[PDB]
Amino acid sequence: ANLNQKKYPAKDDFPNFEGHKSLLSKYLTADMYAKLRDVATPSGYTLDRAIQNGVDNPDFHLGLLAGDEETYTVFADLFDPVIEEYHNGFKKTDNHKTDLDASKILDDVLDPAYVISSRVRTGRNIRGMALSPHVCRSERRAIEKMVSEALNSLAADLKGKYYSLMKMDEKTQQQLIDDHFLFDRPVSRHFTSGGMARDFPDGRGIWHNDKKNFLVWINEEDHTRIISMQMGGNMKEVFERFTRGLTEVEKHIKDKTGKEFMKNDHLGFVLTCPSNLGTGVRCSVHAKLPHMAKDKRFEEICTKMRLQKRGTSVGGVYDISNLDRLGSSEVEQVNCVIKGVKVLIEMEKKLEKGESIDDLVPK
Amino acid sequence: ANLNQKKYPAKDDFPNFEGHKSLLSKYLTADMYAKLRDVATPSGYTLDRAIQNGVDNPDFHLGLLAGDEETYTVFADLFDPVIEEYHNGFKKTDNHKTDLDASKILDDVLDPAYVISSRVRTGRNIRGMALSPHVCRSERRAIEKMVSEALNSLAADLKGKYYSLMKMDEKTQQQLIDDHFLFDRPVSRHFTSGGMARDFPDGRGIWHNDKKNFLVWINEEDHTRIISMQMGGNMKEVFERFTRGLTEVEKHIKDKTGKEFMKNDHLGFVLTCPSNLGTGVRCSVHAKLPHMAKDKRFEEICTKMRLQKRGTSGSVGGVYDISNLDRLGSSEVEQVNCVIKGVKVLIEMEKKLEKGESIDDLVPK
Ligand SMILES: [Mg+2]
Numbered sequence: 001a002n003l004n005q006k007k008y009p010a011k012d013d014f015p016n017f018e019g020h021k022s023l024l025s026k027y028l029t030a031d032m033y034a035k036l037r038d039v040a041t042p043s044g045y046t047l048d049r050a051i052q053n054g055v056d057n058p059d060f061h062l063g064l065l066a067g068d069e070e071t072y073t074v075f076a077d078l079f080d081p082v083i084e085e086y087h088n089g090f091k092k093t094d095n096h097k098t099d100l101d102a103s104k105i106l107d108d109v110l111d112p113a114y115v116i117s118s119r120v121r122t123g124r125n126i127r128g129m130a131l132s133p134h135v136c137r138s139e140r141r142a143i144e145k146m147v148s149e150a151l152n153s154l155a156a157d158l159k160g161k162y163y164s165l166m167k168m169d170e171k172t173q174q175q176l177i178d179d180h181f182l183f184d185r186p187v188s189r190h191f192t193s194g195g196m197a198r199d200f201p202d203g204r205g206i207w208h209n210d211k212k213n214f215l216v217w218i219n220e221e222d223h224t225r226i227i228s229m230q231m232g233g234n235m236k237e238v239f240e241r242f243t244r245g246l247t248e249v250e251k252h253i254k255d256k257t258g259k260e261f262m263k264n265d266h267l268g269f270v271l272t273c274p275s276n277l278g279t280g281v282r283c284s285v286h287a288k289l290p291h292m293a294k295d296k297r298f299e300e301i302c303t304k305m306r307l308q309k310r311g312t313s314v315g316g317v318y319d320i321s322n323l324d325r326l327g328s329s330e331v332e333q334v335n336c337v338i339k340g341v342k343v344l345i346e347m348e349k350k351l352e353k354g355e356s357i358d359d360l361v362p363k
Numbered sequence: 364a365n366l367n368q369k370k371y372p373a374k375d376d377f378p379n380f381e382g383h384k385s386l387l388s389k390y391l392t393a394d395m396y397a398k399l400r401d402v403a404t405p406s407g408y409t410l411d412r413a414i415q416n417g418v419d420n421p422d423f424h425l426g427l428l429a430g431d432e433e434t435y436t437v438f439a440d441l442f443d444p445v446i447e448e449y450h451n452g453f454k455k456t457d458n459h460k461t462d463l464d465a466s467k468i469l470d471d472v473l474d475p476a477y478v479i480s481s482r483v484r485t486g487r488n489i490r491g492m493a494l495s496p497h498v499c500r501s502e503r504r505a506i507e508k509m510v511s512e513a514l515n516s517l518a519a520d521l522k523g524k525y526y527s528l529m530k531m532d533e534k535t536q537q538q539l540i541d542d543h544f545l546f547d548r549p550v551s552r553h554f555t556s557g558g559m560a561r562d563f564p565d566g567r568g569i570w571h572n573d574k575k576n577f578l579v580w581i582n583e584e585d586h587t588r589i590i591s592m593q594m595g596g597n598m599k600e601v602f603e604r605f606t607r608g609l610t611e612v613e614k615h616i617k618d619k620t621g622k623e624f625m626k627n628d629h630l631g632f633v634l635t636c637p638s639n640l641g642t643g644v645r646c647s648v649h650a651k652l653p654h655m656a657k658d659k660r661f662e663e664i665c666t667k668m669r670l671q672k673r674g675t676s677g678s679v680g681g682v683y684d685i686s687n688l689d690r691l692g693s694s695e696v697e698q699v700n701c702v703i704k705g706v707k708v709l710i711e712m713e714k715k716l717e718k719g720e721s722i723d724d725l726v727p728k
Contacts, residue, residue: 001407002406002407002408002493002497002498002499002502003405003406003407004406004493004499004502005499005501005502008499008501008502008505009501012500012501012504012505013499013500013501014500015500015562015565016529016565018529018530019530042366043365043366043367044364044365044366044367045365048499048500052561052562055561055562055565056560056561056562056563129367130365130367134365135365136365136367136368136371136376136411137375137376137377137378137411138368138371138372138375138376139365139367139368139371141375142371142375166379192555192560193560193561197419197555197556198415198418198419198556199378199415199418199419200419202378202379202418
């Protein structure tokens with residue numbers, strides 16, 4: 001912390017939020033800032049650090065990042081209401097329930113003429129270590145060691161290889177961009193304002209299995225980002241492999257180091273960005289929906305079905321994923337995607353024939 | 364600091380300097396890092412913050428940024444040898460002498476046929492305040508207040524106007540851009556890795572006089588960057604206005620706040636990047652030297668006269684920005700007079716080459 005800050009009136013340190021569009025700017029009042037300015041977490045993370053992402057970027061919707069598990073409680077005055085609004089009324093008294101039971105996922109296979117690929121991604125942080133905005137090189141390397149040792153322990157169709165981002169041959173970097181496996185190196189304003197780019201590429205890397213359907217990015221925005229993906233529409237298969245991977249990686253880490261994933265009854269899994277709390281899950285498809293793209297109801301229809309659509313901007317190809325993360329389970333979110341993409345595909349198919357979809361539109 | 368870091372052995376924290384090209388990588392050994400990793404300055408700046416700029420950017424030459432004046436002492440084991448190498452042998456036991464006496468600047472006007480423009484630039488920080496990698500919003504605002512008040516007080520030829528960067532309208536932004544008056548927003552990795560981009564545009568501004576020949580940037584890399592510049596070769600006039608402006612601003616800050624510029628007997632003016640210590644002066648002319656440009660000795664002649672040259676254009680060929688090489692260990696008077704004397708010689712050599720005569724006897728040996 002800058003030790004002379006505490007000597008100035010808090011009003012002199014209060015961010016100027018004129019022109020800001022963030023939940024940070026909405027909830028961090030003058031009086032709240034003066035209350036918490038000089039309160040640090042047990043690892044040394046400060047209020048200013050926590051909000052720097054929003055203060056530097058008035059166009060961001062959220063504006064906050066956690067530096068450690070305790071950020072969420074030490075600064076609960078700020079984090080609680082931002083989480084409540086972002087997550088559609090999820091109160092400090094509400095609690096989050098996990099459900100990783102792959103037997104409960106809808107077994108429909110999404111039509112592969114429309115669904116290019118199906119994916120389930122999540123994040124996990126290791127309890128006992130600071131999060132990316134705050135983590136130091138020794139912490140980050142320890143995380144790298146434990147996570148990569150757990151991944152290198154996977155066998156059969158989960159057998160793979162770890163690729164450190166520091167150790168990278170030229171026939172290597174090219175190949176991984178080739179599969180598109182490489183995470184963007186951290187130049188966006190979101191990563192640099194949030195302290196998350198420090199030391200790059202030290203401590204970061206990418207693990208994938210040989211069959212290229214299970215992939216883990218290490219020490220990016222969360223200590224791990226775990227992704228199961230495959231061609232076509234068999235979402236239940238993707239989820240089953242996701243859960244087995246997750247289970248075995250967790251087991252290895254606990255058996256070898258005693259460490260566990262950050263998690264609590266209130267927030268479920270703790271992630272760096274409050275937008276990702278709860279399940280941390282982005283369950284998506286890449287779907288070819290060019291008639292839906294020409295339809296002015298497309299965003300509204302997605303929203304009503306609890307889906308987000310994200311395009312490249314081409315082709316009418318959209319990433320379609322779950323909007324909801326906190327206060328519903330993984331099983332619910334994945335099934336929401338399956339149910340809703342099924343409807344989009346049926347609509348796309350009617351529109352190709354110049355037929356009505358008006359009766360398929362959700363209430 | 365991250366309180367968890369002290370839980371781990373220093374070896375686990377030591378940067379991996381493979382492929383680095385910086386003086387940081389050359390001097391920060393494993394044992395020195397172990398010694399200093401958990402030592403902070405009184406304001407709380409840490410070793411890892413000071414080195415972050417270079418750890419993130421293997422090609423940067425220095426790789427270090429100071430967060431406060433104490434950075435240089437608390438981490439002297441690292442800063443001293445980096446300073447000694449970059450500044451051509453300036454030792455921890457050497458002390459810098461300041462001389463800002465404008466009456467000592469040579470009055471030669473460099474030939475206007477050859478000298479297009481003349482500029483003197485320096486930076487100053489405010490003693491006892493954190494530097495840009497570390498400063499908080501309240502300090503940075505108080506700096507803007509005391510500096511902008513001082514500049515607004517200036518009169519006569521120095522009368523001018525302050526432009527805050529917050530909420531600057533597009534009309535003004537365009538005018539200042541056209542004048543080459545506005546500084547870059549801090550998107551460069553030098554600024555992001557060094558913690559100098561925080562809160563932008565909060566606390567930042569630019570001031571210039573109505574005559575547009577004196578310009579100040581507030582809260583960019585140093586708390587102030589101060590520039591005096593005009594067309595032609597009257598460097599003595601440029602320096603006189605520079606020093607008069609600096610004297611008046613410093614006197615106003617001293618009277619209104621009791622603060623003054625950050626400076627000590629060893630390093631002279633204390634700036635954020637160790638490259639700018641001592642005088643922090645870059646005294647330059649643009650000079651039309653197309654024949655010297657084709658002489659293979661041009662560079663060694665410059666170094667020998669303690670000048671640096673850099674090609675420039677924007678279209679007439681053969682133009683060079685010729686500036687002082689030294690910052691630490693010689694005075695502002697010495698560095699500005701080195702430019703004036705050096706450019707005089709270059710123009711004589713250039714005039715000889717124009718007639719295909721030899722310069723063999725004029726090259727210092
Ligand atoms: Mg801090």
